[PDB]
Short mmCIF file of C-alpha atoms and ligand atoms in Angstrom, two decimals:
data_model
loop_
_atom_site.label_atom_id
_atom_site.label_comp_id
_atom_site.label_asym_id
_atom_site.label_seq_id
_atom_site.Cartn_x
_atom_site.Cartn_y
_atom_site.Cartn_z
CA UNK A 1 -46.69 -110.81 72.18
CA UNK A 2 -43.92 -109.18 71.03
CA UNK A 3 -41.14 -107.35 72.27
CA UNK A 4 -42.10 -103.55 72.48
CA UNK A 5 -39.77 -100.06 70.85
CA UNK A 6 -38.56 -99.25 73.57
CA UNK A 7 -37.73 -103.74 74.76
CA UNK A 8 -34.91 -102.34 72.02
CA UNK A 9 -33.54 -99.86 72.93
CA UNK A 10 -33.25 -100.51 76.54
CA UNK A 11 -30.86 -104.22 75.19
CA UNK A 12 -29.34 -101.04 73.33
CA UNK A 13 -28.73 -99.08 77.50
CA UNK A 14 -27.95 -102.24 78.76
CA UNK A 15 -25.16 -102.84 75.68
CA UNK A 16 -27.03 -105.98 75.67
CA UNK A 17 -27.78 -105.57 71.74
CA UNK A 18 -23.94 -104.28 70.53
CA UNK A 19 -22.90 -105.29 67.32
CA UNK A 20 -26.03 -104.06 65.76
CA UNK A 21 -26.75 -103.41 61.97
CA UNK A 22 -27.55 -101.94 59.64
CA UNK A 23 -29.67 -102.07 56.96
CA UNK A 24 -31.23 -98.43 54.33
CA UNK A 25 -32.39 -97.75 51.48
CA UNK A 26 -34.21 -94.83 49.96
CA UNK A 27 -37.24 -94.19 52.54
CA UNK A 28 -34.72 -92.43 54.55
CA UNK A 29 -33.49 -90.28 52.56
CA UNK A 30 -37.41 -88.86 51.96
CA UNK A 31 -36.58 -86.51 54.07
CA UNK A 32 -34.14 -84.22 53.24
CA UNK A 33 -35.90 -84.78 49.90
CA UNK A 34 -34.49 -87.79 47.42
CA UNK A 35 -37.82 -89.49 46.45
CA UNK A 36 -37.97 -92.91 47.14
CA UNK A 37 -39.14 -96.43 43.46
CA UNK A 38 -41.93 -97.69 45.02
CA UNK A 39 -44.23 -94.69 47.02
CA UNK A 40 -47.25 -94.72 45.28
CA UNK A 41 -47.19 -90.97 43.91
CA UNK A 42 -43.58 -89.21 44.82
CA UNK A 43 -42.06 -92.89 43.62
CA UNK A 44 -39.51 -91.91 40.25
CA UNK A 45 -41.19 -95.55 39.27
CA UNK A 46 -44.31 -93.97 38.85
CA UNK A 47 -43.14 -90.35 37.56
CA UNK A 48 -40.85 -91.11 34.62
CA UNK A 49 -42.93 -91.46 32.12
CA UNK A 50 -41.06 -88.53 30.70
CA UNK A 51 -37.47 -89.93 30.01
CA UNK A 52 -36.72 -91.49 27.11
CA UNK A 53 -37.74 -95.11 28.39
CA UNK A 54 -39.51 -98.21 27.88
CA UNK A 55 -39.94 -98.66 30.73
CA UNK A 56 -39.00 -96.87 34.37
CA UNK A 57 -36.08 -99.73 35.41
CA UNK A 58 -34.19 -99.09 32.95
CA UNK A 59 -32.98 -96.01 33.98
CA UNK A 60 -30.88 -97.79 35.88
CA UNK A 61 -30.30 -100.56 33.66
CA UNK A 62 -26.67 -100.86 32.26
CA UNK A 63 -27.76 -101.97 29.14
CA UNK A 64 -29.96 -99.15 28.29
CA UNK A 65 -26.92 -96.59 30.09
CA UNK A 66 -24.90 -98.56 26.52
CA UNK A 67 -28.28 -97.98 24.17
CA UNK A 68 -28.85 -93.81 25.52
CA UNK A 69 -26.34 -92.47 29.01
CA UNK A 70 -28.67 -88.73 28.28
CA UNK A 71 -31.97 -90.05 30.57
CA UNK A 72 -29.48 -90.96 33.12
CA UNK A 73 -26.92 -88.41 33.89
CA UNK A 74 -30.43 -85.89 32.78
CA UNK A 75 -31.91 -87.93 36.36
CA UNK A 76 -28.20 -87.91 37.91
CA UNK A 77 -28.12 -83.90 37.93
CA UNK A 78 -30.05 -84.09 40.41
CA UNK A 79 -29.11 -86.20 42.61
CA UNK A 80 -25.54 -86.10 42.45
CA UNK A 81 -24.07 -85.30 46.65
CA UNK A 82 -23.82 -81.88 47.30
CA UNK A 83 -27.62 -80.61 47.37
CA UNK A 84 -29.02 -82.66 49.54
CA UNK A 85 -28.22 -83.06 53.53
CA UNK A 86 -28.36 -85.70 55.83
CA UNK A 87 -31.79 -86.20 57.93
CA UNK A 88 -32.05 -87.53 61.63
CA UNK A 89 -32.10 -90.92 59.97
CA UNK A 90 -28.73 -90.17 59.23
CA UNK A 91 -27.63 -88.29 62.52
CA UNK A 92 -28.61 -91.61 64.34
CA UNK A 93 -27.05 -93.98 62.97
CA UNK A 94 -23.50 -91.08 63.76
CA UNK A 95 -24.68 -91.36 66.60
CA UNK A 96 -24.44 -95.26 67.24
CA UNK A 97 -21.03 -94.90 65.74
CA UNK A 98 -20.13 -92.78 67.93
CA UNK A 99 -21.12 -95.31 71.04
CA UNK A 100 -19.50 -97.39 69.51
CA UNK A 101 -22.34 -99.85 68.68
CA UNK A 102 -22.59 -100.17 64.71
CA UNK A 103 -21.21 -103.30 63.71
CA UNK A 104 -21.35 -102.27 60.28
CA UNK A 105 -24.13 -99.91 57.85
CA UNK A 106 -25.04 -101.57 54.82
CA UNK A 107 -26.96 -99.39 51.98
CA UNK A 108 -28.67 -99.69 49.35
CA UNK A 109 -28.80 -95.76 48.37
CA UNK A 110 -26.50 -94.16 45.71
CA UNK A 111 -27.22 -90.55 47.48
CA UNK A 112 -23.84 -90.78 49.16
CA UNK A 113 -26.45 -89.12 52.78
CA UNK A 114 -24.22 -91.59 54.93
CA UNK A 115 -20.15 -90.45 54.52
CA UNK A 116 -22.13 -87.47 54.55
CA UNK A 117 -22.76 -87.68 58.36
CA UNK A 118 -19.83 -88.70 59.68
CA UNK A 119 -19.84 -92.71 58.89
CA UNK A 120 -16.72 -93.79 58.48
CA UNK A 121 -16.08 -95.30 54.83
CA UNK A 122 -14.35 -98.25 57.07
CA UNK A 123 -18.17 -99.21 58.80
CA UNK A 124 -20.33 -98.42 56.02
CA UNK A 125 -20.98 -100.88 52.90
CA UNK A 126 -22.50 -99.70 50.22
CA UNK A 127 -23.98 -101.77 48.53
CA UNK A 128 -25.16 -99.87 45.06
CA UNK A 129 -21.57 -97.79 45.14
CA UNK A 130 -21.07 -94.19 44.57
CA UNK A 131 -20.76 -90.59 42.99
CA UNK A 132 -17.66 -90.33 44.43
CA UNK A 133 -16.01 -92.44 42.16
CA UNK A 134 -16.06 -92.51 38.06
CA UNK A 135 -15.38 -95.00 35.44
CA UNK A 136 -14.49 -94.64 31.42
CA UNK A 137 -17.33 -97.43 30.15
CA UNK A 138 -14.59 -97.67 27.02
CA UNK A 139 -10.60 -98.33 28.46
CA UNK A 140 -11.96 -98.42 32.56
CA UNK A 141 -9.13 -95.80 32.87
CA UNK A 142 -10.54 -94.69 37.26
CA UNK A 143 -11.53 -90.30 36.69
CA UNK A 144 -11.99 -87.63 40.06
CA UNK A 145 -15.57 -88.21 40.78
CA UNK A 146 -14.95 -84.12 41.60
CA UNK A 147 -14.16 -83.27 38.34
CA UNK A 148 -17.13 -85.55 36.08
CA UNK A 149 -19.08 -83.36 38.44
CA UNK A 150 -18.23 -80.33 36.26
CA UNK A 151 -19.40 -81.86 33.26
CA UNK A 152 -23.00 -83.11 34.69
CA UNK A 153 -23.82 -80.02 35.91
CA UNK A 154 -22.86 -78.08 33.10
CA UNK A 155 -24.93 -80.89 31.58
CA UNK A 156 -22.58 -82.35 28.78
CA UNK A 157 -22.06 -86.00 28.51
CA UNK A 158 -19.19 -86.81 30.14
CA UNK A 159 -16.34 -88.07 28.21
CA UNK A 160 -13.15 -89.44 28.41
CA UNK A 161 -9.70 -87.45 27.90
CA UNK A 162 -8.42 -89.95 26.60
CA UNK A 163 -11.14 -92.29 24.31
CA UNK A 164 -13.73 -89.86 24.38
CA UNK A 165 -15.37 -93.61 26.01
CA UNK A 166 -18.41 -92.45 28.71
CA UNK A 167 -17.13 -92.15 31.55
CA UNK A 168 -19.96 -93.81 34.09
CA UNK A 169 -20.12 -92.55 37.43
CA UNK A 170 -19.23 -96.31 40.73
CA UNK A 171 -22.86 -97.31 40.40
CA UNK A 172 -24.56 -100.95 40.16
CA UNK A 173 -26.48 -100.71 37.41
CA UNK A 174 -29.79 -103.59 37.25
CA UNK A 175 -27.63 -106.73 36.62
CA UNK A 176 -24.27 -105.68 36.84
CA UNK A 177 -21.94 -107.28 39.93
CA UNK A 178 -22.10 -105.54 43.91
CA UNK A 179 -19.07 -104.20 45.13
CA UNK A 180 -16.25 -106.15 46.64
CA UNK A 181 -17.33 -104.45 49.84
CA UNK A 182 -20.74 -106.59 49.91
CA UNK A 183 -17.90 -109.34 50.87
CA UNK A 184 -18.11 -108.10 54.27
CA UNK A 185 -21.75 -109.68 54.59
CA UNK A 186 -20.32 -113.47 55.37
CA UNK A 187 -18.07 -112.09 58.64
CA UNK A 188 -20.92 -109.59 59.91
CA UNK A 189 -24.49 -110.98 60.05
CA UNK A 190 -23.67 -114.22 62.31
CA UNK A 191 -21.97 -111.78 64.05
CA UNK A 192 -24.47 -109.33 64.45
CA UNK A 193 -27.32 -108.74 68.11
CA UNK A 194 -29.12 -106.71 66.41
CA UNK A 195 -30.94 -106.31 63.28
CA UNK A 196 -32.25 -102.37 62.78
CA UNK A 197 -34.22 -102.61 58.30
CA UNK A 198 -35.40 -98.96 57.91
CA UNK A 199 -36.32 -97.59 54.84
CA UNK A 200 -36.94 -100.43 52.52
CA UNK A 201 -39.27 -102.94 50.88
CA UNK A 202 -37.04 -105.32 50.43
CA UNK A 203 -38.05 -106.92 47.43
CA UNK A 204 -35.09 -106.16 45.68
CA UNK A 205 -32.12 -109.05 46.03
CA UNK A 206 -29.54 -110.03 48.51
CA UNK A 207 -31.20 -107.38 50.47
CA UNK A 208 -34.32 -108.96 50.94
CA UNK A 209 -32.36 -112.08 51.94
CA UNK A 210 -29.59 -110.56 54.40
CA UNK A 211 -32.05 -110.38 56.89
CA UNK A 212 -32.99 -113.85 57.34
CA UNK A 213 -28.96 -114.15 57.56
CA UNK A 214 -28.91 -112.73 61.27
CA UNK A 215 -29.07 -115.63 63.78
CA UNK A 216 -32.88 -116.61 65.05
CA UNK A 217 -33.06 -114.94 68.87
CA UNK A 218 -31.46 -112.16 67.13
CA UNK A 219 -33.39 -109.25 67.38
CA UNK A 220 -34.91 -107.35 63.61
CA UNK A 221 -36.81 -104.02 64.33
CA UNK A 222 -37.98 -101.87 60.99
CA UNK A 223 -39.20 -98.74 60.86
CA UNK A 224 -40.14 -98.37 57.58
CA UNK A 225 -43.94 -97.09 56.36
CA UNK A 226 -45.10 -101.20 55.96
CA UNK A 227 -43.99 -104.29 57.05
CA UNK A 228 -42.50 -105.86 54.15
CA UNK A 229 -40.45 -108.24 53.10
CA UNK A 230 -39.61 -111.88 54.91
CA UNK A 231 -40.32 -110.06 58.42
CA UNK A 232 -43.71 -109.86 56.36
CA UNK A 233 -43.54 -113.24 54.74
CA UNK A 234 -41.43 -115.43 57.77
CA UNK A 235 -41.52 -113.10 61.20
CA UNK A 236 -39.53 -114.36 63.94
CA UNK A 237 -40.11 -114.50 68.32
CA UNK A 238 -38.55 -111.55 68.42
CA UNK A 239 -39.90 -108.82 65.87
CA UNK A 240 -40.61 -105.53 65.78
CA UNK A 241 -42.49 -103.26 63.84
CA UNK A 242 -42.57 -99.93 64.37
CA UNK A 243 -44.69 -98.44 61.18
CA UNK A 244 -44.99 -94.86 60.32
CA UNK A 245 -42.86 -92.55 59.40
CA UNK A 246 -39.08 -92.99 59.46
CA UNK A 247 -38.58 -89.95 60.76
CA UNK A 248 -41.15 -89.80 63.86
CA UNK A 249 -40.46 -94.10 64.45
CA UNK A 250 -35.87 -92.84 65.06
CA UNK A 251 -37.25 -90.12 66.70
CA UNK A 252 -39.08 -92.84 69.29
CA UNK A 253 -36.06 -94.76 69.70
CA UNK A 254 -34.18 -91.47 70.23
CA UNK A 255 -35.72 -90.89 73.44
CA UNK A 256 -36.73 -94.24 74.83
CA UNK A 257 -32.90 -95.00 74.36
CA UNK A 258 -33.09 -91.94 76.53
CA UNK A 259 -30.79 -89.62 73.39
CA UNK A 260 -32.95 -86.89 72.55
CA UNK A 261 -30.65 -84.27 73.69
CA UNK A 262 -27.43 -85.89 72.26
CA UNK A 263 -29.05 -85.94 68.93
CA UNK A 264 -30.39 -82.68 69.16
CA UNK A 265 -26.98 -81.01 70.11
CA UNK A 266 -25.11 -83.36 67.17
CA UNK A 267 -27.93 -81.97 65.14
CA UNK A 268 -27.94 -78.93 65.38
CA UNK A 269 -23.32 -78.63 65.32
CA UNK A 270 -24.37 -80.40 61.86
CA UNK A 271 -26.67 -78.54 60.17
CA UNK A 272 -28.61 -76.50 62.04
C1 OAD B 1 -31.65 -99.76 40.59
C2 OAD B 1 -31.37 -100.44 41.82
O1 OAD B 1 -30.59 -101.53 41.60
O2 OAD B 1 -31.80 -100.03 43.20
C3 OAD B 1 -32.17 -99.40 44.03
C4 OAD B 1 -33.10 -99.86 45.35
O3 OAD B 1 -31.72 -99.60 45.42
C5 OAD B 1 -33.86 -100.68 44.97
C6 OAD B 1 -34.26 -100.74 46.40
O4 OAD B 1 -35.34 -99.98 46.73
P1 OAD B 1 -35.08 -99.06 48.20
O5 OAD B 1 -36.14 -99.97 49.02
O6 OAD B 1 -33.94 -98.79 48.47
O7 OAD B 1 -36.71 -98.25 47.74
P2 OAD B 1 -37.74 -98.84 47.40
O8 OAD B 1 -38.65 -97.62 46.93
O9 OAD B 1 -37.92 -100.00 46.72
O10 OAD B 1 -38.84 -98.97 48.94
C7 OAD B 1 -38.23 -97.24 49.75
C8 OAD B 1 -39.40 -97.57 50.99
O11 OAD B 1 -39.38 -96.93 52.18
C9 OAD B 1 -40.28 -96.44 52.18
N1 OAD B 1 -40.48 -95.25 52.64
C10 OAD B 1 -40.53 -93.74 51.76
N2 OAD B 1 -40.60 -93.11 52.41
C11 OAD B 1 -40.75 -93.09 53.70
C12 OAD B 1 -40.95 -92.13 55.12
N3 OAD B 1 -40.61 -91.16 54.50
N4 OAD B 1 -41.41 -93.01 56.27
C13 OAD B 1 -41.13 -94.53 56.43
N5 OAD B 1 -40.68 -95.05 55.34
C14 OAD B 1 -40.78 -94.45 53.74
C15 OAD B 1 -41.69 -96.62 51.02
O12 OAD B 1 -42.51 -97.30 52.03
C16 OAD B 1 -40.91 -98.33 51.20
O13 OAD B 1 -41.38 -99.22 52.09
O14 OAD B 1 -34.03 -101.15 44.23
C17 OAD B 1 -34.46 -100.06 43.16
O15 OAD B 1 -34.03 -101.50 41.69
N1 OCZ B 2 -31.70 -92.36 47.83
C1 OCZ B 2 -30.92 -92.98 46.70
O1 OCZ B 2 -29.38 -93.30 46.77
C2 OCZ B 2 -32.13 -94.05 46.03
C3 OCZ B 2 -33.23 -93.38 44.71
C4 OCZ B 2 -32.44 -92.06 43.73
C5 OCZ B 2 -31.99 -93.53 42.62
C6 OCZ B 2 -31.37 -94.66 43.86
C7 OCZ B 2 -31.30 -94.95 45.28
N2 OCZ B 2 -30.79 -95.76 45.31
C8 OCZ B 2 -30.31 -96.34 43.79
C9 OCZ B 2 -29.41 -97.56 43.74
C10 OCZ B 2 -29.01 -97.94 42.72
C11 OCZ B 2 -29.43 -97.12 41.00
CL1 OCZ B 2 -28.53 -97.08 40.70
C12 OCZ B 2 -30.37 -95.68 41.55
C13 OCZ B 2 -30.32 -95.52 43.13
CL1 CL B 3 -45.76 -82.09 29.34
NA1 NA B 4 -33.68 -93.47 22.26
ZN1 ZN B 5 -11.20 -93.87 28.17
#
């Protein structure tokens, strides 16, 4: 006795849902070639034995970064924007934006692929910050994101040209304050008429709890390998779970929306 994925498509087609709030995590970028955290076998938290860490979470903790920033920058050579491309998941969200349906996209990812896919900054809440800008950890001087990359790609720990203190990209490490734009969740979540949650385990707060901030009649559509978080534990009557690979699930929705040729055209134009 549940809504189907077709029911969600048909709400969108009818513009009965036209203020969509989306929440994403690391699962949406595995198809682009970036590991997630928690997937058995391939996740970061399963495969950081080599790094100089007390435990894997440490690489993304501000305290440990001060001790040794090397593991973080070693790893960020890779993760640094330029070398991965958005996938169909990202371009679907672009298409939602272009059709006037996207209220806001909240991302936990630092890969920057939402911006890469053409989502305007005003539509985006990068809840864990960005590599696009950087900041001295001693003097607070801001820097050209790009300038820091020069150093990172050439295997050097970025130091301030002024105080020589370590320059850190504007990423929210563990325990750190969320970015200023995160405050938009108070205007957004009550206004949302559909919530889409893609590729996240919903293990970390505040995202786990935002899924409960939408009004009780709002459908929640999960596209993800597993049923997770508040959707597993506190199901609501208009929840839909499309479980399986995220690209498959998005492609199923896109087909039900009638957008398949538009998405093919989009993707070919952008990346093909
Ligand atoms: C360091 C920090 O503060 O923040 C990071 C991160 O932003 C935060 C949230 O983790 P996040 O929820 O983003 O990542 P996780 O790695 O915790 O969750 C990824 C979710 O995506 C699913 N998944 C991965 N690939 C998939 C695929 N191809 N198709 C379908 N599902 C797939 C995977 O099963 C999991 O549920 O945990 C970490 O603590
Ligand atoms: N695809 C990603 O962006 C994921 C996987 C790459 C590392 C990463 C992600 N999300 C993060 C959130 C905070 C911090 Cl410090 C790191 C990450
Ligand atoms: Cl070895
Ligand atoms: Na050490
Ligand atoms: Zn400095």
